[PDB]
Assembly symmetry: C3
Homo-oligomer: 294 residues x 3
């Protein structure tokens, strides 16, 4: 795209504020940002807020979201689809033209770990070029294992293909498959989907802790066989709904767009890889590390 | 196949009749029929009854099926495998030669949404060329959410490859991935697996309704990440068994041959896409629409 | 690998012995062994004990495993990762150099049907060349359907690619996809992952029996749509955990590394194919047979 040549828009922080007991304002941008997806490889991503996956959004079950999208792309229209919400797609997930803004409103009345993404046609193009992320909706009455959890992180899986290559997006294998982590609390890491960051700067935990991961596989195209080496998931909630409650799973199957809450215990000091167990994807990037110390 | 050149056998209606409180007769054909799978693209499909996927079959839990297959193919043998039934494959799913008929009998004692398909070797060839469909077995005591449902439809996912190309069927990506809908009640649409019909003639619903979809992914080869844009599934029954009961799922993972009953609420007027969220498949056809009016 | 040319190390039996009420010794080898994976096709596999998948391991829930690996490979390091155990990967799943041994100790405190595999980098290479298998951990209080089961077998799914070809392992479709069976009791078959053995020498059962299969899909890369032709699974326990309890499933979705216990009834005499319903995989080998007699 000739209007993207040389464009590298600095990342902009997510803006969010609660405006009532059950109402929240969220304010994101669509923007064109260079991301290093593998060592030496820059992808001029289409993003929300200059991150891909986009910034983490967390709301409470029952919250109405009043969402604004500011489109900084000079030429391409963008939009937002949150999987958390009940909405009319053809009224509420519509395009925002270059250099304009749009505001849309809709309720999040289901707890869980939901994908969000651009919904502009062709959707595959928009998601593959980087316009994906996660919204977590916290359950009103929690999960039944809340009191057992010591520490929590967010992980997102995505793929990268040949740059803006529709034929590759539809017909090709991924070039890279990657994890990212998005921050829940001050001090947590906040990364982009790349092959290396969570290997070189592992997530951190303490011996004996029960870890919860909020996870989503945003695709665009692949399913994920999510596994943590050296442990067994004690509890799994499919899509993060507390009712969907599995126990003792070695590996969690995630459809494209699928989420889960998983919880496991790290019993001994050491570094614990986190993988998709489709090992062609692992090999192409999708390995994160959790370093567990005394 | 030289004996298929120029062959285009008109579709024949499914014949079905109840012959006892727990016994039903079903009568299908195997036939060679030209189907438009994408605009301008004809596939000379191998079919049941001149539809691909084949016609919908609905029986009650406990019904014995007395199934007859009339093979109208001039040269290729065909057969029937219903996933609903308990049967001896090597006695009851056997071939019916060109211009002959065979009758087989077997019980459907498990509720759910089951694939059926030809079982002639090589099975991949027979399923890929179009010999697939769905049988629904209705549970004796229903589903626990029956009283909440306003409206229901059947959707089937399948793939199409290069015409009768075994190498492509085994080694290639799909050319097209498509939905079809099969009628449950008078007036419902009844379509074939193509890229466009359920975009141009959407399924219809009313604002506020709870929708149930009977869904099956017949493959042959891919798994499906089934999602309805702008809603969350309130309830999911895996394989349509009322015991397998998930809640609040954004996306349902379907193995090849896998089914589900899913239920969701459409809260606002508009058009709601229905997709597999493996967006390379979506892009290659697998998008249906649900138009929701006042 | 020049040091593997001409190498074909005879298979060595698994050594296992109980050394306390909750402690077991296991002793395996890593070795280079020619396996016939399809008729006329030899793969010089990297294996545990000269079988691929490796030998079956069965322990009780609560057992500590004291595992020894003897590396007979003349040049490549190997390791062991059991999905059953809680362990520090970077202390307990470490490499054993050529012509050396290592002993590692760790608890299996979760019931189920777990993958094991080499964990040497690049893991994809080690798993693809044959270093995979299953450990079953038997639940302390069984499964609730134990008393209904007549007969049981173990089945494992894996893929084979172009020989030791990293590009193919990461980017290519499988050449073959295969089942194997591993013995639980004297007289049961014990086979390697190949296209033909369980077609030519089917598993055996009697009319009317309820069959349990312990199943795992070891990948490396594909997911599995597991189905038995001519029946419906009465009960399914995901990952073999008795809590994860589905009913009436036609087809069970298995992630890569994913397991299950499945149970079904064979009602009539005949031969019952067992497949992955991703029929491109079936066609490339992944069909086993169960011959059911009076
Ligand atoms: Cu309130
Ligand atoms: Cu507002
Ligand atoms: Cu966009
Ligand atoms: Cu979506
Ligand atoms: Cu792929
Ligand atoms: Cu703790
Ligand atoms: Cu009766
Ligand atoms: Cu009859
Ligand atoms: Cu046929
Ligand atoms: Cu089948
Ligand atoms: Cu494909
Ligand atoms: Cu209603
Ligand atoms: Cu004891
Ligand atoms: Cu010992
Ligand atoms: Cu190894
Ligand atoms: Cu593993
Ligand atoms: Cu493949
Ligand atoms: Cu019995």
């Amino acid at each position: 795209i000739a209007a993207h040549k040389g464009v590298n828009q600095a990342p902009v922080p997510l803006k969010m504020e609660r405006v009532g007991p059950h109402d929240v304002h969220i304010e994101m941008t669509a923007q064109i940002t260079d991301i290093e997806i593998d060592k030496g490889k820059i992808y001029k991503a289409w993003t929300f807020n200059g991150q891909a996956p986009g910034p983490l959004v967390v709301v409470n079950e029952g919250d109405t979201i009043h969402f604004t999208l500011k489109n900084m792309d000079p030429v391409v229209p963008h939009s937002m689809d949150f999987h958390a919400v009940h909405a009319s797609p053809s009224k509420d997930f519509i395009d925002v033209m270059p250099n304009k803004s749009g505001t849309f409103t809709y309720p999040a009345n289901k707890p869980g770990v939901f994908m969000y993404h651009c919904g502009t046609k062709p959707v595959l193009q928009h998601i593959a070029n980087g316009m994906h992320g996660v919204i977590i909706v916290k359950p009103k009455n929690g999960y039944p294992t809340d009191k057992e959890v010591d520490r929590e992180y967010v992980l997102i899986q995505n793929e990268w293909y040949k740059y803006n290559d529709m034929n590759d997006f539809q017909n090709g294998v991924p070039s890279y498959v990657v994890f990212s982590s998005k921050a829940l609390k001050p001090g947590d890491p906040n990364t982009n989907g790349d092959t290396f960051t969570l290997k070189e700067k592992p997530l951190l935990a303490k011996v004996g802790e029960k870890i919860r991961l909020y996870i989503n596989n945003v695709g665009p195209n692949e399913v994920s066989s999510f596994h943590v080496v050296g442990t067994v998931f004690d509890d799994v909630y499919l899509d993060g709904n507390p009712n969907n409650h599995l126990q003792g799973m070695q590996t969690v199957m995630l459809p494209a767009s699928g989420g889960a809450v998983v919880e496991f215990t790290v019993t001994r000091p050491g570094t614990y890889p986190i993988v998709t167990h489709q090992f062609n994807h692992a090999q192409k990037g999708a390995v994160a590390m959790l370093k567990v110390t005394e």
